[PDB]
Design a protein around this ligand. Structure first.
Ligand SMILES: Cc1cc2nc3c(=O)[nH]c(=O)nc-3n(C[C@H](O)[C@H](O)[C@H](O)COP(=O)(O)OP(=O)(O)OC[C@H]3O[C@@H](n4cnc5c(N)ncnc54)[C@H](O)[C@@H]3O)c2cc1C
Ligand SMILES: N[C@@H](Cc1c[nH]c2ccccc12)C(=O)O
Ligand SMILES: N[C@@H](Cc1c[nH]c2ccccc12)C(=O)O
Length: 627
């Protein structure tokens, strides 16, 4: 009887296959000939973009220990090459075929295939990814489209990449959305670049719900009156958040765009522009786009008839070339037959940690939990460890499964509360999930085991990347020691972010919000840092048209558009004129912490930072019931 069958092999299954090989557990892989979207994109030569997530969050620990020198954003080419490299290692263990049906019994499943071969396995893992409407626009994108108008009903990373590729051919873009949360992918902290996933310090949730919420929620909720922030200059960017019924912030179910702010784009790529664009580093600054009117926001019920293909905003009847519906992603699940008769219904919320379904035996889901920020790698590595331990250690299997039904109800209570299931339930803060899985496995850190102030920085401020949990214990990876050292030395041990929590502990929601924005450049959607880069933008667009061999006439003026922009940017052209502390508070906080770094916490004497730093040994909201 085959012990483990893995269905689908692309990116998600890679670390589970590694653990099964390591323990010499018996496994076969079934994966389709056709491959993934990355195989589509490679074939048609469209691996010409970059990830919206950092190296440290996007490649697995066993690759990072060998290949990390600095923080950067990998290209689509680099991500693919890394899938392919791992595919080559395991190809001989992969049966090329398509699973059409799984019949699940008490201690085995019967797997049926397109070819007609059947397989019996005790443990089955699905790692099949998602179908995405948007993949076709992307995989079959026509660059000859010039001077046309596009309407998008949804803003996601996929829409944002399409927009990046359209604007250089002077294609005009209308968003007819109920708003969107967007973040600068890279940010300046007193002159050093941090990826947004380095500043989330998630373990501070354990000190209190209320404190973590102040740290994180101001750039997402409309909590500041500061007229520099995109969501005051362009209020139609704001979303309905009435659905949220959870004290856990940022809530599960919140999706965001990650984009290159033009300033950071400038700092990295200005000196070799054509070369960078051709590797896949594309300017996708949605906030620059609103500021320059190259995109505009129109309310979600604006007038448009799909028959004549027109949208009507002001008194211009605007001919549009295409409507883009909205990226829906549903798991590529085969038919699963409960007891071999009753079709299993997939619902993220009715699985434990996105992995363990109810009513099925020895079936696990790998790759169907989405990170709010950072790459999938953080989520799939910890899932691979979770599933590996469940499969190879019957003790662990029993413990989790014993009260699985209550675990799921406790989890849904904590993270979703009473809110109706939503299509984005599968979206979790990465540094919550990695840590949740760490505590179920038992490869977590105990805060009470922190000795020095250094140790408190590691526990609270050092990101909860999967590799953070592979330094020691059951799933230790060699090299992580060195890796953590390099990351610490390049990021001043994450003191800056640790000092953030200190600065806002005594503040309230409103105070915290305005402090977050009292910087010269606040982290996210600072509209003071756009106008300066209008000339670089024109140089960028020129450089893009050179790499993509495009000719377009800028001497040709679409008048119709300019008038539409004026109406969109009204609140902006009124609120932006009223422009003209965090910087100083971090400055002196970092100096204080970089001095008492090796100081014993218990030793610390009875300003009030001190008392709070000592209570970090006994956080009062450590309780997670679903564990
Ligand atoms: C355009 C795009 C950009 C992305 N950018 C990023 C990024 O910047 N950062 C990041 O972290 N993540 C990113 N992702 C998400 C993630 O990294 C990819 O979705 C990744 O391909 C998911 O890996 P997977 O292994 O779960 O699925 P896939 O890579 O799709 O692999 C699943 C495999 O299973 C096969 N298969 C499916 N059904 C069956 C079946 N019934 N039987 C047999 N074989 C089957 C498929 O053919 C495929 O070969 C991006 C995704 C897309 C689409
Ligand atoms: N705590 C940091 C970073 C941060 C806030 N909200 C975020 C959301 C996503 C990623 C990072 C963040 C800040 O206040 O600026
Ligand atoms: N393009 C897909 C998947 C995706 C893009 N970037 C990601 C980063 C992490 C995880 C998944 C993704 C979507 O947003 O629908």
């Amino acid at each position: 009887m085959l012990e483990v069958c893995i269905i689908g092999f692309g990116f998600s299954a890679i670390p589970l296959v590694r653990e099964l090989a390591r323990t010499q557990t018996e496994f076969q892989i079934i994966s389709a000939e056709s491959g993934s979207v990355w195989d589509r994109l490679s074939e048609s030569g469209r691996l010409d973009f970059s990830l919206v997530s950092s190296f440290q969050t996007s490649f697995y620990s066993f690759d990072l220990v060998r290949d990390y020198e600095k923080d950067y954003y990998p290209t689509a080419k680099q991500f693919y090459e890394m899938h392919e490299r791992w595919r080559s290692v395991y190809e001989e263990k992969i049966i090329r075929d398509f699973v059409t049906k799984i019949e699940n019994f008490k201690d085995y499943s019967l797997i049926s295939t397109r070819s007609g071969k059947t397989y019996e396995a005790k443990h089955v893992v699905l790692a099949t990814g998602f179908d995405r409407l948007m993949n076709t626009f992307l995989s079959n994108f026509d660059n000859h489209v010039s001077n046309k108008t596009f309407v998008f009903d949804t803003m996601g990373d996929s829409a944002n990449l399409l927009i990046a590729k359209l604007i250089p051919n002077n294609n005009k873009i209308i968003l007819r959305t109920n708003g969107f949360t967007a973040f600068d992918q890279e940010v300046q902290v007193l002159g050093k670049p941090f990826t947004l996933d380095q500043l989330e310090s998630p373990n501070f949730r354990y000190v209190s719900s209320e404190l973590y919420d102040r740290l994180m929620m101001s750039p997402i909720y409309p909590r500041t009156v500061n007229p520099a922030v995109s969501y005051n200059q362009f209020p139609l960017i704001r979303r309905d958040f009435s659905w949220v019924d959870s004290k856990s912030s940022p809530p599960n179910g919140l999706i965001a765009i990650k984009y290159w702010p033009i300033d950071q784009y400038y700092y990295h790529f200005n000196d070799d522009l054509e070369n960078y664009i051709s590797k896949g580093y594309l300017l996708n600054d949605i906030a620059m786009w609103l500021h320059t009117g190259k995109v505009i926001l129109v309310p979600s019920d604006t007038p448009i008839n799909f028959d004549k293909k027109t949208i009507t905003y002001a008194g211009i009847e605007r001919s549009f070339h295409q409507y883009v519906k909205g990226d829906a992603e549903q798991p590529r699940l085969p038919t699963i037959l409960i007891n071999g008769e009753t079709p299993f219904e997939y619902l993220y919320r009715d699985t434990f940690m996105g992995v363990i379904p109810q009513r099925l035996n020895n079936i696990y889901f790998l790759g169907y939990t989405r990170p709010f920020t950072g790459g999938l790698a953080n989520i799939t590595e910890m899932q691979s460890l979770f599933i590996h331990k469940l499969i190879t250690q019957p003790q662990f299997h029993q413990k989790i499964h014993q009260n699985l039904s209550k675990r799921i109800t406790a989890y849904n209570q904590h993270y979703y509360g009473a809110a109706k299931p939503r299509k984005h339930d599968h979206t979790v803060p990465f540094g919550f999930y990695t840590e949740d899985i760490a505590r179920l496995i038992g490869i977590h850190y105990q805060p009470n085991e922190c000795r020095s102030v250094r140790d408190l920085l590691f526990y609270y401020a050092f990101p909860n990347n999967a590799f953070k949990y592979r330094l020691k214990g059951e799933y230790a990876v060699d090299g992580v020691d060195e890796l953590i050292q390099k990351v610490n030395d390049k990021h001043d041990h994450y003191a800056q972010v640790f000092v953030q929590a200190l600065s806002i502990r005594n503040m309230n929601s409103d105070e915290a919000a305005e402090w977050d924005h009292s910087a010269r450049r606040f982290a996210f959607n600072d509209m003071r840092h756009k106008e300066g880069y209008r000339a670089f933008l024109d140089t960028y667009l020129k450089a893009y048209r050179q790499v993509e061999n495009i000719s377009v006439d800028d001497t040709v003026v679409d008048e119709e558009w300019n008038f539409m922009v004026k109406e969109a940017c009204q609140v902006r052209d009124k609120v932006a004129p009223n422009i003209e502390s965090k910087d100083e508070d971090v400055n002196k906080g970092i100096r204080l912490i970089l001095s008492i770094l090796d100081s014993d916490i218990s030793s610390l004497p009875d300003a009030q930072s001190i008392e709070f730093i000592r209570r970090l040994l006994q956080p009062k909201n450590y309780e997670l019931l679903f564990i």
